[PDB]
């Protein structure tokens, strides 16, 4: 398989699919009208539900997972008490860190606010 | 301001995996003259835990039970197929590769099987480095009669199996699996060079399996790897995990340990390659001249128990000299130890001189040298892969002996 | 459930210089 | 480093190691003072020889004094010196001195697992099961892993002593 073309460069055969896979053309297509859906999913916090399901795919026992998460959150609160309880929750921080430890980027503790609040004092009125 | 200021693999290779729930994170497939490899497309930052690199679903593998009886997961062989009769007649202990070769041929003949597509990225007969494809000329350059005898016996066994099970009267569905012997030989070579054995739990069943795993056999071997394989049973996924807390930079190759504690001869026999920094290589000394193990370890900063020798890499600072070769030397040099008894330097000088004499005798026993072997490799233009593999094997052995000599020299120098 | 299975040398000894 | 200095160091080190292997710390100190007179600076090897000479004939105070001399000389002690000191402390049953030596070894960027194993094994050997258990548990809670033989030894000895808690 070794062959040099007289100039020091080694010529080698590139590997190619050389076959038809009908699953390629039919599957690599994107829906164009899910901007509001994705934004609403991020706003309500379903990405954290997906993260929680993902973390349990590597756990033999879910009760052990819950106990370990609670212990880690307790350590977080004991070390830095003042940083939690408001916009940052310890359990959410633990979940985000465990997701981030896998190499998947997430906002810290899933802490988000509304950029459209019309100044201080105004509270969003939920539409039931 | 922005205005003032190895080749990438075939995209279809990852695309066919990607459309079937194969996910590679932070790594890209690159192809070079040596072969396929996996490299970090960016800087893999070190986290608290192991990071997920690859995810290969179970349904894309070709796995067989490692112990009798033979059950395949997922079950691709239909009931009553003669390929099961061919598989079931093999020797349970040593004929594991034959069963995987039969499964590979059967899958290659299956129209809806994934490996009919992934099989186009396996190395061909002229690209595979396995010694089952080596001729008598290539084996003559191993400079090791034992390895040559082992390779000849393996080739004989493979050819005997093919002749026994692929005679004239076999049905057409079997004859088309391997029309001629070299096809089955290539199948066995691929099985030997790419098989992964593991203990996997599927549902409630825990068992050992011999597995042909796509996108994970592309990882290259290392005795100091940055990645390891972890089976996830809940969703039946094989994970490639980078070591926890080990930073990996852009372009750094992702490697796993194919088999720990195996010398270069076993690596050549199984995967058809060898490495110069094998920390388990052995050189047969007479044992009459011995040095102090503790001083040798302390000079080169080799810590841990005899089965976990490891270079600290901190006190050395920039000493590239200390590597797996020094560890192998410490594991193979004749040594003595008396708890806290210090060594007298004068005896160490004589011992290292005698050991260097033995090493130079061994180097002289070889017809050629290592530098001339490297020059032959550089000037090589019309040789098979196994030819260069044998040349590199003997060159690596010579390099290991030379490294032992230099290590003894610097050890006797630094003893004061 | 979650309750199952019970849930100084080298100092004061530096080189004088 | 000329050949003359190398030969002088070879002769002095050979004599020092010969005296150290003969359990003669005073002779080792004589050779060290000869090195000082001759201009040869005592490296960590010479102080290691002195420490070994003191430790071989069960002399913990002199060994610690030799370590203090090595530290005051500005030299970095070898791992062998530290493991010899921890083994001496374990043989004498001085668990706290062994822990201090382990802390010093950790501070000097050294692997303390082997020395921890040596210390606990020596404490077991000299019938100091309480201190052996204490040091073993300190190391185990610290993340260190012991050998299978040491695990079995600790379990069996503790259960023979009637100590189910440890
Ligand atoms: N560290 C290494 N150095 C040289 N060859 C290696 C190697 N690790 C693995 N290999 C080779 O790679 C094969 C394993 S499959 C790995 C990918 C392969 N090179 C390809 O392009 O398809 C083995 O047959 C072995 O010969």
Annotation, overall tally of beta strands of chain A: 0
How far is it from the N-terminal to the C-terminal residue of chain B, by CA?
57 Å
Mass-distribution shape of chain B: globular
Radius of gyration of chain A: 24 Å
Total helical elements of chain A: 5
Main sheet summary of chain A: none
| Element-level helix/strand string of chain A | HHHHH
Q: Between the first and last Cα atoms of chain A, what is the distance in angstroms?
A: 70 Å
Say what oligomer this is.
part of a larger assembly
Total beta-strand segments of chain B: 17
Bound molecules: S-adenosyl-L-homocysteine
The proportion of strand residues of chain A reads under 5%
Principal-axes geometry of chain A comes out as elongated
Largest interface: A-B, 29 and 38 residues
Binned, the helix content of chain B reads 25-40%
Structural class of chain A: mainly alpha
How do the strands line up in the largest sheet of chain B?
A: 2-5-12-11
Quickly count the helices of chain B.
14
The percent range for strand residues of chain B is 15-25%
Structural class of chain B: alpha+beta
Give me a quick take on this structure.
This is part of a larger assembly, with chains A (128 residues), B (416 residues), C (17 residues) and D (166 residues). Chain C is largely without helices or strands and 17 residues long.
List the helices and strands and how they pair.
This is part of a larger assembly, with chains A (128 residues), B (416 residues), C (17 residues) and D (166 residues).
Chain A: H1 22-27, H2 35-44, H3 47-56, H4 62-79, H5 90-100
Helix pairs in contact in A: 3-5, 4-5
Chain B: E1 7-8, H1 11-18, E2 23-24, E3 27-31, E4 36-40, E5 51-57, E6 62-65, E7 72-73, H2 82-88, H3 96-109, H4 115-118, H5 136-140, H6 145-165, H7 172-175, H8 181-194, E8 195-202, E9 205-212, E10 220-221, E11 227-232, E12 237-242, E13 255-256, H9 264-270, E14 291-292, H10 293-300, E15 302-303, E16 310-311, H11 324-332, E17 335-336, H12 345-365, H13 370-379, H14 385-414
Parallel strand pairs in B: 10-13, 14-17
Antiparallel strand pairs in B: 1-3, 2-5, 3-4, 5-12, 6-7, 6-9, 8-9, 11-12, 15-16
Chain C: no helix or strand
Bound molecules: S-adenosyl-L-homocysteine.
């Amino acid at each position: 398989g070794i062959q040099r073309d007289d100039n020091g460069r080694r010529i080698w055969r590139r590997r190619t699919l050389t076959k038809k896979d009908d699953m390629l053309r039919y599957k690599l297509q994107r829906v164009p009208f899910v901007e509001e859906q994705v934004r609403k999913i991020k706003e309500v916090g379903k990405v954290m539900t997906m993260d929680i399901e993902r973390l349990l795919l590597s756990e033999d026992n879910r009760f052990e997972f819950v106990n370990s998460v609670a212990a880690e959150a307790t350590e977080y609160v004991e070390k830095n008490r003042d940083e939690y309880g408001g916009t940052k929750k310890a359990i959410f921080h633990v979940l985000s860190n465990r997701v981030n430890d896998l190499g998947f980027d997430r906002p810290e503790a899933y802490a988000e606010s509304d950029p459209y609040k019309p100044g201080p004092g105004y509270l969003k009125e939920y539409y039931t | 301001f922005p205005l003032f200021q190895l080749e990438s693999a075939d995209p279809d290779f990852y695309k066919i995996g990607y459309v079937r729930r194969v996910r590679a994170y932070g790594v890209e497939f690159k192809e070079g003259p040596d072969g396929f490899g996996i490299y970090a497309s960016k800087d893999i930052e070190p986290r608290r835990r192991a990071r997920v690199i690859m995810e290969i679903p179970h349904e894309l593998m070709i796995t067989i039970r490692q112990k009798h009886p033979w059950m395949f997961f997922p079950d691709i062989v239909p009931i009553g197929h003669p390929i099961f009769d061919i598989i079931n007649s093999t020797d349970p202990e040593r004929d594991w590769d034959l069963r995987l070769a039969c499964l590979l041929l059967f899958s290659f003949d299956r129209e809806d099987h994934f490996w009919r597509l992934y099989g186009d990225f396996l190395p061909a007969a002229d690209e595979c480095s396995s010694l089952l494809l080596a001729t008598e000329e290539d084996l003559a350059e191993l400079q090791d009669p034992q390895l040559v005898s082992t390779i000849r016996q393996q080739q004989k066994r493979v050819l005997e199996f093919w002749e026994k099970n692929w005679h004239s009267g076999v049905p057409l569905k079997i004859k088309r699996l391997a029309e001629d012997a070299e096809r089955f030989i290539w199948a066995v070579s691929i099985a030997q060079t790419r098989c992964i054995s593991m203990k996997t739990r599927i549902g409630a069943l825990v068992q050992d399996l011999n597995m042909m795993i796509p996108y994970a056999d592309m990882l290259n071997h290392s005795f100091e790897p940055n990645c390891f394989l972890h089976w996830r049973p809940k969703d039946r996924i094989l994970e490639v995990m980078s070591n926890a807390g080990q930073a990996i930079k852009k372009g750094e190759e992702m490697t796993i340990n194919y088999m720990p504690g195996q010398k270069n001869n076993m690596l050549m026999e199984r995967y058809g390659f060898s490495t110069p920094v094998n920390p388990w290589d052995a050189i047969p000394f007479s044992g009459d001249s011995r040095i102090h193990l503790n001083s040798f370890l302390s000079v080169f900063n080799i810590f841990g128990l005899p089965e976990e020798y490891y270079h600290d890499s901190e006190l050395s600072g920039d000493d590239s000299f200390v590597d797996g070769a020094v560890i192998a030397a410490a594991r193979t040099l004749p040594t003595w130890s008396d708890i806290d008894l210090p060594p007298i330097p004068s005896a160490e000088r004589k011992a290292v001189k005698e050991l260097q004499d033995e090493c130079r005798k061994m180097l002289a026993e070889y017809p050629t040298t290592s530098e001339q072997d490297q020059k032959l490799l550089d000037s090589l233009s019309e040789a098979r892969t196994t030819f260069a593999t044998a040349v590199k094997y003997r060159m690596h052995r010579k390099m290991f002996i030379g490294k032992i000599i230099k290590a003894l020299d610097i050890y006797q120098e630094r003893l004061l | 459930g979650t309750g199952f299975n019970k849930g100084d040398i080298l100092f004061y000894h530096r080189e004088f210089c | 480093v000329s050949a003359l200095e190398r030969s002088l160091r070879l002769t002095f080190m050979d004599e020092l190691m010969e005296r150290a292997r003969n359990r003669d710390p005073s002779g080792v100190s004589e050779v060290i003072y000869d090195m000082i007179a001759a201009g040869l600076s005592p490296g960590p090897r010479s102080f290691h020889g002195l420490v070994v000479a003191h430790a071989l004939n069960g002399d913990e105070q002199g060994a610690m004094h030799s370590l203090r001399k090595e530290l005051g000389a500005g030299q970095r002690p070898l791992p062998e010196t530290m493991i010899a000191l921890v083994r001496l402390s374990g043989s004498k049953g001085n668990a706290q001195r062994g822990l201090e030596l382990l802390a010093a070894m950790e501070k000097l960027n050294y692997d303390i697992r082997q020395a921890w194993l040596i210390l606990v094994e020596e404490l077991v050997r000299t019938n100091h099961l309480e201190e052996a258990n204490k040091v073993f548990l300190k190391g185990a809670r610290g993340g260190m892993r012991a050998t299978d033989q040491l695990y079995d030894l600790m379990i069996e000895e503790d259960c023979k002593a009637g100590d189910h808690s440890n």
